[PDB]
């Protein structure tokens, strides 16, 4: 079963970009390593940052809504005029602090 | 086409200003500026924010003249900006509403008690979506977004 | 030398111009002359952060990848926005739909090359210059990419006749068009930091030998 | 006006933690009382130690 990015953010599938960003800031501030010292907080914050990195991009959100996480990470078959038969699948870079830095403009929110 | 409903019961002087500026029945003001939204351009578009047009003088966003003069007072703030498509004036401060209008692209509750909301967008969801999807440089649209015609759709 | 456009400016030289009447700022390795911008926006409240950060490096204001201001997303609004902890400055759009702000400025000052005057010598080192005639010695802070022509241009107040001198390092003549590393004066600053001593005592010295004053 | 910790360490505001530690190590070795006998060296060393103490902590650096 794929990871539900909307359920990770704790919101609805048809939530707008403001609701996605409001879910991210509340959950990132709650599960930040500087504020939360739980061992599972780092994994939860990494999942939330990965979920936000998909849903903030309209192209990543559209593929994930159409084909799921399996289609998004594994790529989709290109139906028109491509040498590569599949798209470059979405790979998370594994740095949840980079999504935090992009969202909050720095390391300190 | 972007069709707007104007809450004349809530903001009568405001909606009359917008409707006359839509129709252009006032002609020219005392400063020689046409009081009509034809060829008035959307000079400011903000992603997940608003699209701003109605600069009937230069299209630069620093000017604009209402039908009661250069600026008219804020009528009320009863209408909230709680949804996408809320129509109000962009002003230079308190009691400085002109001809420049903004259409909200999402719920913007922070705009309450600062800008007079007087209406909503009722037709043209794809038109507003394409205007939102127009790329911008420092919130100014790269493409040339213009109001080709304006007035009363049922006249 | 009247129309000589200097390509490299030291951080001390950039910090020397930190006035409203002569304002130089540096970010991402480039030096920008915003004197015209300050004269245009004199009396504006948006000029105050620029006057405050005048003569200082503002690379922390800008994203190194996109060469624009760093962008934060406001938690209340859910929107992307330039992050200005010190307040809004020139050519930055406001927070709200405001009809007193105009987008007619076109390209901003941080994106246009009109205000750019050259590059910043972020990496720099001291070199001693010792004459073999009068036994005089100076210490000059020069860049690694700075040529010996630019080094002698900086040294020209100290010796206007130094263009007629033969520049030598460890007994061999220096190439005039080359840099210090190309000539052979290696940069041992990282070695000195690893080995933990003072590098001022062992700043490399260039010997000037007199030939004629013609 | 407060003391500029970046100017005391001789680094820019965009310097990383490794550059802060390297600038602190070089300046502390130069201005140590066992090596430098100048009267101003003790005050300069105290300012550098205060500058490193602020900039090493991410929370103190964020507040500053």
Curated annotation (Swiss-Prot), chain A:
Endpoints of the signal sequence: none
Q: Where is the J domain?
A: 4-68
Tissues in which the protein is found: Specifically expressed in testis and trachea.
Cellular location(s): Cell projection, Cilium, Flagellum
Its job: Functions as part of axonemal radial spoke complexes that play an important part in the motility of sperm and cilia.
Q: How does it assemble?
A: Homodimer. Component of the axonemal radial spoke complex 1 (RS1), at least composed of spoke head proteins RSPH1, RSPH3, RSPH9 and the cilia-specific component RSPH4A or sperm-specific component RSPH6A, spoke stalk proteins RSPH14, DNAJB13, DYDC1, ROPN1L and NME5, and the anchor protein IQUB. Interacts with SUN5. Interacts with IQUB.
Q: Which disease is it linked to?
A: Ciliary dyskinesia, primary, 34: A form of primary ciliary dyskinesia, a disorder characterized by abnormalities of motile cilia. Respiratory infections leading to chronic inflammation and bronchiectasis are recurrent, due to defects in the respiratory cilia. CILD34 inheritance is autosomal recessive.
Supply the name of the protein.
Answer: DnaJ homolog subfamily B member 13
Which gene codes for it?
Answer: DNAJB13
Q: Which residues of the full protein are shown?
A: 1 to 109 of 316
Swiss-Prot record, chain B:
Q: Looking at the record's lineage, which domain of life comes first?
A: Eukaryota
Q: What sequence ranges are listed for the domain PPIase cyclophilin-type? A: 1-152
Question: What's this protein's function?
Answer: Probable inactive PPIase with no peptidyl-prolyl cis-trans isomerase activity.
Membership in a protein family: Belongs to the cyclophilin-type PPIase family.
Q: What is this protein called?
A: Probable inactive peptidyl-prolyl cis-trans isomerase-like 6
From Swiss-Prot, chain C:
**Origin species:** Homo sapiens (Human)
Entry keyword annotation includes Endoplasmic reticulum: no
Task: Give any Gene Ontology cellular component.
Answer: cell projection
- Coiled coil (UniProt feature): none
Query: InterPro entries annotated for this entry?
Result: Cyt_B5-like_heme/steroid-bd, Cyt_B5-like_heme/steroid_sf, Cytochrome_b5_domain
One GO term in the molecular function aspect is:
metal ion binding
Name of this protein: Cytochrome b5 domain-containing protein 1
Principal localisation: cytoplasm
Source taxon at top rank: Eukaryota
Annotated residues that bind heme are located at 41, 72
Please, one GO biological process term? cilium movement
The Cytochrome b5 heme-binding domain covers which part of the protein? 6-72
Q: Name one Pfam family in it.
A: Cyt-b5
Q: Which UniProt keywords apply?
A: Cell projection, Cytoplasm, Cytoskeleton, Heme, Iron, Metal-binding
Q: What does this protein do?
A: Radial spoke stalk protein that binds heme under oxidizing conditions. Required for the coordinated beating of multiple cilia maybe by functioning in a redox signaling pathway.
């Amino acid at each position: 079963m794929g990871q539900d990015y909307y359920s990770v953010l704790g919101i609805t599938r048809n939530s707008e970009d403001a609701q996605i960003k409001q879910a991210y800031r509340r959950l990132a501030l709650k599960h930040h390593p500087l504020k939360s010292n739980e061992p599972s907080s780092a994994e939860i914050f990494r999942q939330i940052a990965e979920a936000y990195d998909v849903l903030s991009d309209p192209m990543k959100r559209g593929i994930y809504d159409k084909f799921g996480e399996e289609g998004l990470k594994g790529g989709i078959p290109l139906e028109f005029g491509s040498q590569t038969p599949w798209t470059t699948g979405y790979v998370f870079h594994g740095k949840p602090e980079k999504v935090f830095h992009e969202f909050f403009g720095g390391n300190n929110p | 086409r972007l069709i707007f409903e104007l809450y004349c019961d809530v903001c009568p002087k405001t909606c009359k200003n917008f409707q006359v500026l839509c129709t252009g029945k006032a002609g020219f003001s005392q400063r020689g500026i046409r009081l009509h939204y034809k060829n008035s351009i959307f000079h400011r578009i903000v992603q997940n924010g608003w699209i701003q047009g109605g600069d009937i003088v230069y299209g630069k966003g620093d000017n604009g003249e209402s039908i009661y003069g250069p600026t008219f007072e804020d009528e009320n703030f009863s209408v909230p900006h709680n949804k996408r498509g809320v129509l109000g004036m962009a002003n230079k401060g308190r009691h400085s509403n002109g001809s420049q209008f903004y259409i909200t692209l999402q719920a913007t509750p922070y705009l309450d008690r600062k800008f007079v909301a007087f209406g909503q967008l009722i037709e043209g969801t794809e038109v507003l979506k394409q205007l939102e999807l127009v790329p911008t440089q420092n919130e100014r649209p790269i493409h040339m977004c213009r109001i080709t015609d304006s007035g009363d759709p049922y006249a | 030398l009247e129309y000589f456009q200097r390509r490299y400016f030291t951080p001390a030289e950039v910090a020397q111009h930190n006035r409203p009447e002569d304002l130089w700022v540096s970010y991402l390795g480039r030096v920008y002359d915003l004197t015209s911008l300050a004269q245009e926006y004199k009396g504006n409240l948006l000029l105050k952060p620029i006057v405050e950060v005048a003569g200082q490096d503002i690379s922390h204001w800008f994203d190194p990848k996109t060469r624009d201001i760093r962008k934060h997303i406001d938690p209340l609004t859910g929107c992307l926005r330039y992050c200005t902890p010190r307040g809004r400055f020139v050519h930055v759009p406001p927070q709200l739909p405001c009809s007193d702000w105009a987008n007619d400025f076109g390209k901003p000052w941080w994106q246009g090359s009109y205000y750019e005057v050259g590059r910043l010598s972020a990496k720099t080192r001291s070199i001693r210059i010792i004459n073999t005639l009068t036994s005089q010695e100076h210490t000059l802070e020069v860049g690694v990419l700075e040529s010996i022509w630019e080094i002698l241009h900086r040294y020209l107040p100290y010796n206007s006749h130094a263009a007629s001198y033969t520049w030598k390092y460890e007994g061999k003549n220096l190439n005039m068009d080359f840099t210090l590393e190309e000539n052979g004066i290696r940069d041992e600053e990282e070695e000195f930091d690893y080995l933990s001593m003072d590098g001022t005592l062992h700043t490399p010295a260039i010997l000037l030998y007199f030939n004629d004053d013609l």
